[PDB]
Amino acid sequence: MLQDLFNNYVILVGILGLIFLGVNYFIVESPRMDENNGNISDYIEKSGPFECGFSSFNPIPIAFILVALLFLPFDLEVSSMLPYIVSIYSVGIYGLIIFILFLLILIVGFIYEFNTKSLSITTILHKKNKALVKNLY
Amino acid sequence: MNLEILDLSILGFYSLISSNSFESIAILVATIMPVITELWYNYSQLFALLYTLIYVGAVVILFVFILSVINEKESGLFILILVLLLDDLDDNESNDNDYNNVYITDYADWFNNYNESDLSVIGNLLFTEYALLLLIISFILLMSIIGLILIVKKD
Amino acid sequence: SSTHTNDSLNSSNYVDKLKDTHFVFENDKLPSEIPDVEEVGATTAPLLSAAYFIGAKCQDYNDDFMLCQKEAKGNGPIDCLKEGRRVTRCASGVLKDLNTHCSDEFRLHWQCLSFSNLEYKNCRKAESLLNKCVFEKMNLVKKIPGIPEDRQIHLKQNPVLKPVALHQDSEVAFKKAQNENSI
Amino acid sequence: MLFTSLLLIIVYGSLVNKSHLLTKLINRLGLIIIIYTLLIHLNINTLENLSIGINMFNNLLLINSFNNTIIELILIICILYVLLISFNITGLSIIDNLNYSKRTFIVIVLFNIIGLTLLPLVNDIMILFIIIELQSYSLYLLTAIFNESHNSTKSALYYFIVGSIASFIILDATVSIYDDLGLTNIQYILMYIDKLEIFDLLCLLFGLFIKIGLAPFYSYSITIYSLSPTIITNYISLMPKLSILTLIYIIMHYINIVNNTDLNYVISFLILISMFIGSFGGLNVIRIKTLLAYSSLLNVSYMLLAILSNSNESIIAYIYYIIQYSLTHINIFSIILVISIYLPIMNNMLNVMITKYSPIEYINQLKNLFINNIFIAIALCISIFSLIGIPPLTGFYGKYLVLISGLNNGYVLLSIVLIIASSISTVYYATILKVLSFDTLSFKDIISNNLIINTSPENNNNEIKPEISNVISYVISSLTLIILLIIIQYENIVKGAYLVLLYNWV
Amino acid sequence: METYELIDSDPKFSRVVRYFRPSDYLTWALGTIGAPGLMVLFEKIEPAKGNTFKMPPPSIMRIATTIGFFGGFYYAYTSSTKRFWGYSENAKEVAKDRYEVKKALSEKKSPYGSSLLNPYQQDMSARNSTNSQLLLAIFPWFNVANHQSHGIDLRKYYEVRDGEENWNFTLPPLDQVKDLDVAQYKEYSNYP
Amino acid sequence: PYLVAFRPAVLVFFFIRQPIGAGLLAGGFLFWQADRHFNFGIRDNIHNFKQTILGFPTQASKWETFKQVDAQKRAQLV
Amino acid sequence: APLQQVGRHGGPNKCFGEFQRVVECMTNAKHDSYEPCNNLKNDYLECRKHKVERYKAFLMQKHAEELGKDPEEIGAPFVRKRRFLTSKTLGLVDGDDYEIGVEKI
Amino acid sequence: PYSNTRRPWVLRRHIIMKNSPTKWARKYSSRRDEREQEIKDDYIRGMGE
Amino acid sequence: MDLILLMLVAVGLNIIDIYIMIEILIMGCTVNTIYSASLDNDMIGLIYSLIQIIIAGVESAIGLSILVNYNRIRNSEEIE
Numbered sequence A: 001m002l003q004d005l006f007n008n009y010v011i012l013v014g015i016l017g018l019i020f021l022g023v024n025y026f027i028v029e030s031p032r033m034d035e036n037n038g039n040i041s042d043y044i045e046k047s048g049p050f051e052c053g054f055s056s057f058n059p060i061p062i063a064f065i066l067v068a069l070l071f072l073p074f075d076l077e078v079s080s081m082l083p084y085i086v087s088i089y090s091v092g093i094y095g096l097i098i099f100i101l102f103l104l105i106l107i108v109g110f111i112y113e114f115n116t117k118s119l120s121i122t123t124i125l126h127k128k129n130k131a132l133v134k135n136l137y
Numbered sequence B: 001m002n003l004e005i006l007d008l009s010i011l012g013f014y015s016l017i018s019s020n021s022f023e024s025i026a027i028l029v030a031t032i033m034p035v036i037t038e039l040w041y042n043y044s045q046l047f048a049l050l051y052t053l054i055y056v057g058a059v060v061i062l063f064v065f066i067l068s069v070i071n072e073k074e075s076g077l078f079i080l081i082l083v084l085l086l087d088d089l090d091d092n093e094s095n096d097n098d099y100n101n102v103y104i105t106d107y108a109d110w111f112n113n114y115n116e117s118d119l120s121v122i123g124n125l126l127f128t129e130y131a132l133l134l135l136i137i138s139f140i141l142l143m144s145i146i147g148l149i150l151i152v153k154k155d
Numbered sequence C: 001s002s003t004h005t006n007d008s009l010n011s012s013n014y015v016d017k018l019k020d021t022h023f024v025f026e027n028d029k030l031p032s033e034i035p036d037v038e039e040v041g042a043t044t045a046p047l048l049s050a051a052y053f054i055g056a057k058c059q060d061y062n063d064d065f066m067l068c069q070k071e072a073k074g075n076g077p078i079d080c081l082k083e084g085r086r087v088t089r090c091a092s093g094v095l096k097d098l099n100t101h102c103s104d105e106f107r108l109h110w111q112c113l114s115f116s117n118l119e120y121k122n123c124r125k126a127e128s129l130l131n132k133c134v135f136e137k138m139n140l141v142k143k144i145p146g147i148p149e150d151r152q153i154h155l156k157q158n159p160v161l162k163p164v165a166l167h168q169d170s171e172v173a174f175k176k177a178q179n180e181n182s183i
Numbered sequence D: 001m002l003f004t005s006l007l008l009i010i011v012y013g014s015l016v017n018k019s020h021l022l023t024k025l026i027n028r029l030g031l032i033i034i035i036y037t038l039l040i041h042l043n044i045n046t047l048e049n050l051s052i053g054i055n056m057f058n059n060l061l062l063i064n065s066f067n068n069t070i071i072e073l074i075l076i077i078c079i080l081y082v083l084l085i086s087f088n089i090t091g092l093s094i095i096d097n098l099n100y101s102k103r104t105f106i107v108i109v110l111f112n113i114i115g116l117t118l119l120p121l122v123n124d125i126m127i128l129f130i131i132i133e134l135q136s137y138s139l140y141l142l143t144a145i146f147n148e149s150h151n152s153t154k155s156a157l158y159y160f161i162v163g164s165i166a167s168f169i170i171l172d173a174t175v176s177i178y179d180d181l182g183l184t185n186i187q188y189i190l191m192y193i194d195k196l197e198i199f200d201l202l203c204l205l206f207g208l209f210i211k212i213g214l215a216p217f218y219s220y221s222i223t224i225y226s227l228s229p230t231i232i233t234n235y236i237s238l239m240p241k242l243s244i245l246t247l248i249y250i251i252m253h254y255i256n257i258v259n260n261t262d263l264n265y266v267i268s269f270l271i272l273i274s275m276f277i278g279s280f281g282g283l284n285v286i287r288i289k290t291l292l293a294y295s296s297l298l299n300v301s302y303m304l305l306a307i308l309s310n311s312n313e314s315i316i317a318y319i320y321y322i323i324q325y326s327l328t329h330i331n332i333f334s335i336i337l338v339i340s341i342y343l344p345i346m347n348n349m350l351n352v353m354i355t356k357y358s359p360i361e362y363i364n365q366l367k368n369l370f371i372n373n374i375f376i377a378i379a380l381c382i383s384i385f386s387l388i389g390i391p392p393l394t395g396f397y398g399k400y401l402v403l404i405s406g407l408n409n410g411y412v413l414l415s416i417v418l419i420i421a422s423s424i425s426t427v428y429y430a431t432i433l434k435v436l437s438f439d440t441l442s443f444k445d446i447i448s449n450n451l452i453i454n455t456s457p458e459n460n461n462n463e464i465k466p467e468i469s470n471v472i473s474y475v476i477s478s479l480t481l482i483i484l485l486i487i488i489q490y491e492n493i494v495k496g497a498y499l500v501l502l503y504n505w506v
Numbered sequence E: 001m002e003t004y005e006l007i008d009s010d011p012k013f014s015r016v017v018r019y020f021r022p023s024d025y026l027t028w029a030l031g032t033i034g035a036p037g038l039m040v041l042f043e044k045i046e047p048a049k050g051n052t053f054k055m056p057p058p059s060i061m062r063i064a065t066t067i068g069f070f071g072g073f074y075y076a077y078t079s080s081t082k083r084f085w086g087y088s089e090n091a092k093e094v095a096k097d098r099y100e101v102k103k104a105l106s107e108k109k110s111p112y113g114s115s116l117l118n119p120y121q122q123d124m125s126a127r128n129s130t131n132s133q134l135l136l137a138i139f140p141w142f143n144v145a146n147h148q149s150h151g152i153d154l155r156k157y158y159e160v161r162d163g164e165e166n167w168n169f170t171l172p173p174l175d176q177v178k179d180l181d182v183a184q185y186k187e188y189s190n191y192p
Numbered sequence F: 001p002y003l004v005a006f007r008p009a010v011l012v013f014f015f016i017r018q019p020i021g022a023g024l025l026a027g028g029f030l031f032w033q034a035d036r037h038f039n040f041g042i043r044d045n046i047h048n049f050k051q052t053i054l055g056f057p058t059q060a061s062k063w064e065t066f067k068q069v070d071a072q073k074r075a076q077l078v
Numbered sequence G: 001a002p003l004q005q006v007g008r009h010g011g012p013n014k015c016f017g018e019f020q021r022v023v024e025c026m027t028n029a030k031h032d033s034y035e036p037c038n039n040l041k042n043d044y045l046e047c048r049k050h051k052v053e054r055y056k057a058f059l060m061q062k063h064a065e066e067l068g069k070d071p072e073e074i075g076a077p078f079v080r081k082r083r084f085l086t087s088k089t090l091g092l093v094d095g096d097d098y099e100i101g102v103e104k105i
Numbered sequence H: 001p002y003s004n005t006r007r008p009w010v011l012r013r014h015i016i017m018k019n020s021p022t023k024w025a026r027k028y029s030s031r032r033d034e035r036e037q038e039i040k041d042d043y044i045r046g047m048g049e
Numbered sequence I: 001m002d003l004i005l006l007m008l009v010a011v012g013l014n015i016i017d018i019y020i021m022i023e024i025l026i027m028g029c030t031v032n033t034i035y036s037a038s039l040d041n042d043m044i045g046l047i048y049s050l051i052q053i054i055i056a057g058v059e060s061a062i063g064l065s066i067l068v069n070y071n072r073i074r075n076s077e078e079i080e
């Protein structure tokens, strides 16, 4: 299988990257031509954040962290299913039973993280209600 | 003009001067890409794509995920080029001169009429011959799922 | 399978640059002690078209050529040089026959293979004509070992997987035989 | 039986409500699982049949009578450790409830026992790397099981980094071996034991030397052991050495086929250096766990001399030493988990901050234990006297047997240094005995009611109220008399070690 | 060294269960009720909380029975396996095994059973499950396949021992036994 | 193949952001690549020097063992 | 025993035959020692790295240098760019020297 | 086609990837190479017989 | 050059920079295995490389989890 046609494509796309950047740099009118008030550098008002107009100045939930952390074990489970795809016929029943076992052990992990509700954001800080109880004497 | 040398010299230049964690994560991506590209050509196209799918797609974006969580806070040109040049001189990883100067070939044969990809053979052996290695791996993955939750989960 | 090797042509010229591949020739012919043979000159498509007729005609020599490789015990290339010329001569015999008996039936079929990704499933109409011609003029038949006669794939009247695009020369030649022969 | 029950405990623990009683009851389910494992193991595995060595699972795992000895030992020591987390070590709810605050504690321990028991059996470089990670990953999780603790998490971070570098060295040696030979099975490599770079197996040992805390790598182990909770340090400072030292012994068995002297000189350089640091290091220390970390390094140095010598007497020296040292280690740490009830309470100077993770942290917190509990003080005295090497305790026979193996192979220099290093280390074992008893007669008649044990409620005032729980007391007493009275059955035990073979045969 | 006759180096899972002695079922029963008892015995030894005996909650007793249900079976499975390997008393099983095999060869069926697994898959399966009961205390693995690498010589099932000739079984030459390696490679030397 | 696409773009930003160092690293790279195409042997000599200073079998050393054997295997034919 | 040296198509690769002959000798029962198998061990290492054969190529390169033999006349003709495997070079009767198509098969 | 069998450029030029206990011994220790050079020498030492 | 331990200059001054160096170090081991396996036409070396990539991923996840909890442990006032 030849890939010299593919190589020229990758090279052209690499050339297309330089063209997109520089075409802006050669077609925009000179700062003097428009208003001359300054370049992007000195014009710090124009080169700044957007805060809807008013100038101002990540303790993320642990549930978000466990979403990203648990992505890695579940990704290596999916990527290790790749060898079974292109060899499903020649491993027969034996490799099919092994594959199912390879999935059951990982599912017991899915059960564990489903019961603990690890991914739920939860609301421990707020949403409290109480019963007004009179304390007659 | 083996341009793969110039990519690493740039990479070796920025590894000596990186200060924050943004550049440190950049050295990771700037190292896999030469690893993937030098595997795509030459040695193994299958493991170039496995590296992209597993390293870049899975373990690299996790680094930048936690860097946004951790924090973002806070040499001389002569010594760097002197060090890089000194690092550049001696690049022979092995000292078997004949093994590095004499070329070899293989002879093909037509005895293998059932031609199938490497990933076909790897699955053929991993799911039959070394099914213990495959099963322990799912066991190591299982411990991580439990291991991540016990370390990080608050309550 | 498009794995890189050290034994044939690789995917791209960037593989060659990394490996510093030299494509080396050897002008030296074989020594006169080994009697010469006329090598087969057919390309990929004609061989895949006549493969089952080489199997039908050179079956004894192919088996004997392989049995020499099994029992040479690692010295196969050197100790089977004489038995390897019978196979080359036998296979040249078949291609020479197809050129002098079924030249148009043969060419039609392997033009179809060169038109349809060298797949047997896409060229059944041309292949059926070639098999019928070869049988009457050389007595060779196509047989796939290991299955009953009634369940061979190339005799399947209504195949599940059929060519997407038709070969014009195959469809035209087929219906002509539906008049010449199906009287 | 271990693996199948682990899945049941994983699922069941994630169902039932988070509570201490249920967490403690699940810890008693694991104590059964480990017991059941030992009964099934001893039933099928016999010394008489495993003598030849038997390949299992496509030759990935090879089991013989030397490995089989340690699997049963590992299972036994894991029973004595689980007894701590499964029963009361003090009975005071404040101190004890730490052991029951984590539900995955017993699960991670059961993960490690699978990792520990399979490591000596490995027979393929592909499975060597996988199994060593299964054990290594389980230790990091156990070190960080108390995720609220700042010191515990700081230690697991230090443990993970050092182990990751250690595992990379192990992985790189195997790759280099595969580069030279193209073979993965260890038996196939033995066919080329004369044709490969024998120093690439030494690079493998340098990775396993980091994981047992051998100098110059000793620095991290001392820091880790002095920061983790005493219940955690009781496990991570003993178990890895049980399964790695067995593996190191086997790798050295194959190495001595070609009998390369340069390999032996480098290892002797590390053994010699470690004895120096293991002895002179502990002289100036205040923390008890830092003291037992230097003590651990010295004993690993002794056990490597038996490994390095690697003769027929080296099997006996190693097999006996690894057993007696485990029981001594369990006995000492079990006592330190108990005698925390005798600590005084303030009603000041030096502002010593104590936490519920290491209630006993300094050596002078052992003061006057001869007064508060004389019987347990002698048990700690007998245990320390074994570490010193005073006969006829178990500790003497370990050093005596190690010396036989060392001198029989010409390691004269190392034998003398170990006898110098033993005496230097006696200084800081004697300090523990000085603190235990020497100020008895001045404190004999004192008005003590501010001890931690005096905050225990009075139940009835008529029935007898024992101060220490039942199970922990029986373990301490049993292992103290076994240490003390080994002379009675020593001849049978040693003759029971002559039979443990590693391809000796005839 | 207590050595006996090697009935089967890799006994099949279904065979090992069919060869349980009554005592083996007792061990399986004892293991099943031992684990719930061990939980109770610990509470008698020492209460989990407080100072007085308190029966553990029924939920713990159900999970305890399951854990002891597998452990009892594993102990039963390994004890039954020692007999096949020859490590234990196997005279009773040897006659029972010989009766089945001599009957099997007589019907021209394979003693080992027909198999979906091809030659490589049969031999590969044997490698995984042979001597796998030695680590059955760590993780489970059973021979559930009808392979042919059992570590016996089928010639030894032709000779008649004491009390066997009365069976009057006729044994054909192995070359005519269906699904054996000595009866398959008749057309090609690499295809069965 | 991703470095084929990225290499043109990264080189532009390498010179734009840090031109002076980029000249040297590109200057250094071209110096050795030319020496390989023109056989200046400057990198070969440092390799042949390093092997001598660290005890390795150099190309000269291997050839010497050939000459000792050359003379000796001829000397028997005397 | 476990399979080692499996080719990219599931069969024995180039050097499996040598490795198998080593295992036959080492595990043989008629051998008192491992001396007879020492040559087979060298062949398996030789099959994989060709270190001795590469060394032989080094002397033949070095011996021709000291004799002045012209490399182009002792060596074998070669082509470095695959596009210039032209029919003139391949020896075809009426072959041009125009480049060949190695873009897409 | 004849091609070389040298390790990748990244494996032998990266500022970090090239550092390893065994890669230094391949690069800076003669122990391995002197042992193997004996076998090459003894090839031509055995042509006399 | 690397005998003076130059690679220590190339590793940054954060705990996350150590984690990356461990990955780049192990990456060299896998690339070495893929190199040998392809030359020998041996798929057993490719099985090893596949395991090394999968095992090197699990090591990253555990290390980051410890680092993440290490970070929030300081920022654990949460008395708002």
Ligand SMILES: CCCCCCCCCCCCCCCCCC(=O)OC[C@H](COP(=O)(O)OCCN)OC(=O)CCCCCCCCCCCCCCCCC
Pocket (backbone or CB within 6 Å): A017, B007, B008, B010, B011, B014, B018, B022, B023, B025, B026, B027, B029, B030, B031, B033, B034, F003, F005, F006, F007, F009, F010, F011, F013, F014, F017, F018
């Ligand atoms: C298609 C091209 C894509 C890349 C475009 C950027 C090219 C510029 C050169 C950087 C890439 C070279 C590879 C080595 C990494 C070096 C990263 C670094 O040190 O910082 C570069 C960048 C600019 O900062 P600089 O002034 O150069 O350094 C001092 C700043 N305090 O500091 C920054 O972080 C600014 C944002 C840059 C983010 C780049 C992310 C890393 C690169 C990944 C994409 C390219 C992958 C590597 C391909 C080449 C490998 C040699």
Ligand SMILES: CCCCCCCCCCCC(=O)OC[C@H](COP(=O)(O)OCC[N+](C)(C)C)OC(=O)CCCCCCCCCCC
Pocket (backbone or CB within 6 Å): D470, D474, E044, E045, E046, E051
């Ligand atoms: C075939 C022989 C089997 C013998 C029995 C074995 C199981 C022990 C359980 C008995 C019942 C029980 O626990 O009874 C309870 C007693 C007494 O407890 P106490 O301290 O007075 O608590 C206070 C009791 N109140 C509530 C009445 C006040 O506990 C014991 O004496 C425990 C003895 C230690 C265990 C011995 C095992 C030795 C292991 C040796 C192998 C290495």
